[PDB]
Design a protein around this ligand. Structure first.
Ligand SMILES: *[C@@H]1O[C@H](CO)[C@@H](O[C@@H]2O[C@H](CO)[C@@H](O)[C@H](O)[C@H]2NC(C)=O)[C@H](O)[C@H]1NC(C)=O
Ligand SMILES: *[C@@H]1O[C@H](CO)[C@@H](O[C@@H]2O[C@H](CO)[C@@H](O)[C@H](O)[C@H]2NC(C)=O)[C@H](O)[C@H]1NC(C)=O
Ligand SMILES: *[C@@H]1O[C@H](CO)[C@@H](O)[C@H](O)[C@H]1NC(C)=O
Ligand SMILES: *[C@@H]1O[C@H](CO)[C@@H](O)[C@H](O)[C@H]1NC(C)=O
Ligand SMILES: *[C@@H]1O[C@H](CO)[C@@H](O)[C@H](O)[C@H]1NC(C)=O
Ligand SMILES: *[C@@H]1O[C@H](CO)[C@@H](O)[C@H](O)[C@H]1NC(C)=O
Ligand SMILES: *[C@@H]1O[C@H](CO)[C@@H](O)[C@H](O)[C@H]1NC(C)=O
Ligand SMILES: *[C@@H]1O[C@H](CO)[C@@H](O)[C@H](O)[C@H]1NC(C)=O
Ligand SMILES: *[C@@H]1O[C@H](CO)[C@@H](O)[C@H](O)[C@H]1NC(C)=O
Ligand SMILES: *[C@@H]1O[C@H](CO)[C@@H](O)[C@H](O)[C@H]1NC(C)=O
Ligand SMILES: *[C@@H]1O[C@H](CO)[C@@H](O)[C@H](O)[C@H]1NC(C)=O
Ligand SMILES: [Zn+2]
Lengths: 901, 146
């Protein structure tokens, strides 16, 4: 476009600011002419001038009006100029008002407009969601103005900065229930005409920023409690879901969490009530609409009679994240989307904090490490990565805004902020946190404003101390991509710091102020005793006698991995840590037992340590009973169990893993009374899950026994499942592998009968585990029949069959045989998630030839939707081919040696 | 002939059992055990008469991983409640104790010793819950077996 006029640039001018909106809108939940759903509305926006101009610019998206176009009235006092034309720019979604005359500061003006738009099902703006209950198509009206999409509901100033107050009303079908940010003003009143309609008026909101707006007309009901402070808490779900305490858990914990955050913020909950609604389809996990927070059902509801413990954690930690935003994000909103990282990153950290308060006994807090820290480290360790802080001038198009939702501006964000709260000693962090809130309540902020208030707090205190200023320390982490690998020569005491990529040979090009150096907070432990503390300055090398050892003595850095960095040691300290882990492993904290495994493997990948070394860091597992260290070993090990699983090394490797697990399997067998009562501690349950899964997939007799015996019991009496949801995934995916068509055909029966998505998903995957070639090929056939398997779950199923070592060539041939038919018909299909997961194993020059061919063969009919998924699959193979030719002999010999008894 | 007051402490144990992963009958610790109602409501009973007899009323139900117990113990699952000699220097098993105070409690709180209520399966005795007893020894209140 040709920008020179304030309606060809993507940002709203600073000329006029909104004071308050009067917004009435009416959803038609029954198809219209041509079978079209519509909503009608009428807004009275009241802006204020800040600098004179002859033009008015509000946001407006996909909305028809009344063929003037808007009425302008001056609040009594005001002099109202007249309206020339009244254009509509469909690119920079503006409703442009051209004026004959001008308008000046101080005087507020009111703009009236009535309109209507498509109440489509795009899960965006004001939209409809159709859901099947019984066998009826029900339809409700919900909102999802996230980033933009408020314009898609009514003309307004849709930027997160321009906060305003909102008077909301919903004209709706007489017997449905109207919901919004604030409680209903009074009771719902019969509409003048069409007395089959009611009118529900809502109390005026605080000063929010659109995009936190929510209105819902539905057939829903609720469960509710009232916390000892007057605030009303309500869990909204479908009437049936409410019948059985499906929403009970999500109410049980909503209160406690709501308290925690009140205290942790030294701020009272800023609204009269807190509604959390469970929508059946709702894509984006959840939405923190102020007062009325939307969740996908699997995320908010919990069935104790058909859900795993895994499902419980998901509920607590997502209510936590979303209720967290109720202060930090909505009460004090970040200025622009460029600083989104702070908002989401923060809530991504306090998730666990709030969660932990609800389930004190679970030890969530820890989970941040593997679920967030190491997770994001995998993507922040390539040249492809980027830094959290991106300049505002570089974020404009609604597209650019959306790309602000990386895993970095979420997990990195959380890690970074977690480490911050850690080197300022919590208490202090909360003080700055609070002064920040009170200071900017009901107004915009940048991330620098929080950095300041944390200084204001460290400055006012003499107890703890940092090297440089808070902002100085943070900038090392927020302004440049990646993280360092801290290296320690325990013989001397020397210390290194270096930008850590795992691709030893890389064209890192993103130029960096600071030269990729960090100010690193380094806790440490020497022989279980906690050392003092150190800070790596933005310098390459250093030294301290904290990191020096005797003959028999080990150091170990980054306790509880509260430091966004990876530690490497000299080849002797490792060996000392290994020996410690072998004997009394209780000495090293459990999160570090994880760390040592996570780190050594990533190091081995980067060629900083021998592949064999990371391997020795798993020998201590025969005495390990806790989820996190084991989970670490598996994650990092499963790439091995995929390169070598059709090879000469799978033999000993499979043997080795059986050796390491048996004692753990034994422990749980006993602790759990022959698998009749699951452990209590969430993380202990998580361990039993992996305990079994590993024992079975590696051929441990009693495990295979257990799985069979249980499944037999199930077919011996279906409709009464004896297998605990925790174990179903593993038991199924083994019983079936351990048997013939009797079981497969049975599972297939249960699958088609199943109406709960959890089970369906467990079965569907289990079915792919049969070692019967013909059964797999038959299953591959079913895969393309929407009558039996859902096209959405088709790609999932196919390469879930390719996961099976026997099904590998089956799926490969299938995929590359049925390619035409596919595209030519089924061509959203996720054509790329398929080809990746199928060629996922290719690691031989020959397999590359085949892949190279498939490209050439199906070339005249390209791939699109993925192509870079095919080309990139061709990439991952090269890597694999190389990694194997190098690592094979060593890995083989290692697994061979450490399997003997 | 002086009139004595005899109480029959009808303590009823509602066993709960479930088929193990290996198909064994293992007794769940979730089995209910209720005492005769007194002034309060259960959780504690104190013998307040001249003498007393202890009678154990055992039921039995089974459940799957859902810990909901409806169908009754068919078998290898069938079992009945027995009050094993726990950590007390005496037992009910026929063989005339005498106390100055005798109280049965579900709470371990305020307790001397405890009895082990167990499920007597076929070839197995599995402890399920504990029966706490508060006793002060004397010669005023007798205990008649059977
Ligand atoms: C590192 O994290 C561990 C958890 O993995 C912490 O251990 C807990 O510490 C809390 C206090 O922070 C205690 O209340 C708990 O009893 C501990 N939990 C368990 C399960 O042991 C530990 O505090 C942290 N260690 C250091 C040195 O910071
Ligand atoms: C212990 O007693 C309780 C009843 O007080 C049983 O739990 C209830 O059992 C009925 C069916 O018998 C269910 O419909 C209720 O929903 C249960 N309520 C609760 C609190 O769970 C329980 O089955 C008994 N246990 C045994 C082994 O008999
Ligand atoms: C919204 O309602 C409040 C009264 O609760 C009023 O003060 C405010 O001016 C109203 N806004 C508009 C645009 O009329
Ligand atoms: C907005 O609505 C309120 C009541 O909700 C009403 O009193 C007021 O007149 C309205 N403001 C305008 C500008 O119409
Ligand atoms: C808006 O106007 C368009 C003409 O461009 C018309 O086709 C459409 O039906 C209208 N949309 C709605 C939701 O009324
Ligand atoms: C945003 O907050 C600032 C204070 O940082 C305040 O002065 C300003 O008026 C606000 N701007 C808007 C557009 O609301
Ligand atoms: C509620 O009311 C509408 C008409 O106002 C009706 O069509 C609908 O069937 C009613 N819903 C129920 C559950 O009765
Ligand atoms: C929630 O707590 C109540 C008692 O406060 C308890 O009875 C109920 O079982 C709990 N709900 C769930 C789903 O665990
Ligand atoms: C915040 O908590 C402090 C105690 O830490 C208390 O003194 C203060 O009154 C609280 N502020 C509010 C608004 O409740
Ligand atoms: C092992 O070490 C832990 C502390 O690390 C200690 O509590 C425990 O007593 C030790 N056990 C043995 C057998 O030495
Ligand atoms: C649990 O299983 C083991 C192995 O089958 C067996 O030896 C043991 O007796 C079982 N425990 C029971 C029946 O309580
Ligand atoms: Zn969020």
């Amino acid at each position: 476009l040709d920008q020179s006029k304030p309606w060809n640039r993507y940002r709203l001018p600073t000329t006029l600011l909104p004071d308050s909106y009067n917004v009435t809108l009416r959803p038609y939940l029954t198809p219209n002419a041509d079978g079209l759903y519509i909503f009608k509305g009428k807004s009275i926006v009241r802006f204020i001038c800040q600098e004179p101009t002859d033009v008015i610019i509000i946001h407006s998206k996909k909305l028809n009006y009344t063929t003037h176009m808007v009425v302008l009235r001056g609040v009594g006092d005001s002099q109202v100029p007249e309206i020339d034309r009244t254009e509509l720019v469909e690119l920079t979604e503006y409703l442009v008002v051209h004026l004959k005359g001008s308008l000046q500061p101080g005087h507020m003006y009111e703009m009236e407009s009535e309109f209507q738009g498509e109440l489509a099902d795009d899960l965006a703006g004001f939209y409809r969601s159709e859901y099947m209950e019984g066998n009826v198509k029900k339809v409700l009206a919900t909102t999802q103005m996230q980033s933009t999409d408020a314009r898609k509901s009514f003309p307004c100033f849709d930027e997160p900065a321009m906060k305003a107050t909102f008077n909301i009303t919903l004209i709706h079908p007489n017997n449905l229930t109207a919901l919004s940010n604030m409680p209903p003003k009074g009771s719902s009143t019969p509409l003048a005409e069409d007395p089959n309609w009611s009118v529900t008026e809502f109390e005026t909101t605080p000063v929010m920023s659109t995009y936190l707006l929510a209105y819902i007309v539905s057939e829903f009901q609720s469960v509710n409690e009232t916390a000892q402070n007057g605030v009303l808490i309500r869990i909204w779900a479908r009437p049936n879901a409410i019948a059985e305490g499906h929403g009970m858990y999500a109410l049980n914990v909503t209160g406690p969490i709501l308290n925690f955050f009140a205290n942790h913020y030294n701020t009272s909950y800023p609204l009269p009530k807190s509604d959390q609604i469970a929508l059946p389809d709702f894509n984006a996990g959840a939405m923190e609409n102020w007062g009325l927070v939307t969740y996908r059902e699997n995320a908010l509801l919990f069935d104790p009679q058909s859900s795993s413990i895994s499902n419980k954690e998901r509920v607590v930690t997502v209510i936590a994240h979303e209720l967290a935003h109720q202060w930090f994000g909505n009460l004090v909103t970040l200025a622009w989307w460029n600083d989104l990282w702070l908002n989401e990153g923060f809530a991504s950290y306090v998730e666990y904090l709030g969660a932990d308060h609800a389930e004190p006994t679970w030890n969530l807090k820890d989970l941040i490490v593997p679920g967030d820290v190491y997770r994001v480290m995998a993507v922040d360790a390539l040249a492809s990565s980027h830094p959290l802080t991106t300049p505002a001038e570089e974020v404009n198009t609604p597209a650019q805004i959306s790309e602000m939702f990386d895993s970095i501006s979420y997990s990195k964000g959380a890690s970074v902020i977690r480490m911050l709260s850690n080197f300022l000693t919590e208490d202090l962090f909360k003080e700055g946190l609070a002064s920040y809130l009170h200071a900017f309540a009901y107004q915009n902020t940048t991330y620098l404003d929080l950095w300041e208030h944390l200084q204001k707090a460290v400055d006012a205190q003499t107890s703890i101390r940092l090297p440089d200023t808070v902002r100085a320390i943070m900038d090392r982490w927020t302004l440049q991509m990646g993280f360092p690998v801290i290296t320690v020569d325990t013989k001397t005491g020397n210390i290194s710091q270096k930008h850590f990529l795992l691709d030893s040979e890389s064209n890192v090009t993103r130029s960096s102020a600071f030269d990729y150096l960090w100010i690193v907070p380094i806790s440490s432990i020497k022989n279980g005793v906690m050392q003092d503390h150190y800070w790596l300055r933005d310098v390459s090398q250093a030294q301290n006698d904290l990191f020096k050892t005797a003959s028999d003595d080990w150091v170990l850095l980054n306790v509880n991995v509260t430091g966004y960095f990876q530690v490497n040691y000299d080849e002797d300290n490792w060996r000392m840590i290994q020996h410690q882990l072998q004997t009394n492993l209780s000495v090293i904290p459990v999160i570090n037992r994880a760390q040592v495994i996570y780190d050594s493997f990533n190091l081995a990948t980067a060629h900083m340590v021998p592949v064999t070394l990371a391997l020795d860091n798993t020998l201590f597992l025969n005495g390990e009973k806790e989820y996190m260290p084991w989970q670490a070993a598996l994650s990092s090990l499963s790439y091995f169990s995929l390169m070598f699983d059709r090879s000469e090394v799978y033999g000993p490797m499979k043997k080795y893993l059986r050796k390491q697990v048996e004692p753990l399997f034994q422990h749980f067998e006993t602790l759990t009374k022959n698998w009749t009562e699951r452990p209590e501690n969430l993380m202990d349950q998580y361990s039993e899950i992996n305990a079994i899964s590993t024992a079975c997939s590696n051929g441990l007799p009693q495990c295979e026994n257990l799985a069979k015996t249980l499944f037999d019991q199930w077919m011996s009496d279906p409709e009464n499942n004896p297998i605990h949801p925790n174990l179903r995934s593993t038991i199924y995916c083994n019983a079936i592998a351990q048997g013939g068509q009797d079981q497969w055909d049975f599972a297939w029966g249960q699958l088609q009968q199943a109406q709960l998505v959890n089970e369906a998903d467990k079965l569907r995957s289990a079915l792919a585990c049969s070692n019967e070639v013909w059964l797999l090929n038959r299953y591959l056939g079913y895969t393309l029949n929407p009558d039996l398997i859902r096209k959405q779950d088709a790609t999932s199923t196919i390469n879930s069959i390719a996961s099976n070592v026997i099904g590998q060539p089956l799926a490969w041939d299938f995929v590359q045989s049925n390619w035409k038919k596919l595209f030519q018909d089924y061509g959203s299909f996720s054509f790329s998630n398929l080809i990746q997961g199928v060629t996922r194993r290719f690691s031989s020059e020959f397999e590359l030839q085949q892949l190279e061919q498939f490209k050439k063969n199906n070339m005249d009919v390209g791939f699109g939707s993925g192509t870079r998924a095919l080309e990139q699959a061709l990439e991952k193979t090269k890597a694999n081919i190389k990694w194997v030719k190098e690592n094979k002999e060593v890995v083989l010999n290692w697994f061979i040696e450490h399997s003997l008894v | 002939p002086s009139f004595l007051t005899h109480t029959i402490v009808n303590i009823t144990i509602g066993l709960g059992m479930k088929r193990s992963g290996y198909g064994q009958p293992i007794a769940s610790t979730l089995s209910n055990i209720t005492l005769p109602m007194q002034d309060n409501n259960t959780d504690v009973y104190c013998v307040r008469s001249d003498q007393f007899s202890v009678y154990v009323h055992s039921t039995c139900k089974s459940a799957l991983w859902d810990n909901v117990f409806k169908r009754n113990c068919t078998d290898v699952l069938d079992a009945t409640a027995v009050i094993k000699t726990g950590t007390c220097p005496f037992s009910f098993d026929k063989l005339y104790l005498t106390f100055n105070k005798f109280c049965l409690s579900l709470s371990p709180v305020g307790a001397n010793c405890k009895f082990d209520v167990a499920a007597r399966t076929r070839t197995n005795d599995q402890v399920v819950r504990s029966l706490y007893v508060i006793y002060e020894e004397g010669d005023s209140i007798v205990l008649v077996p059977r």
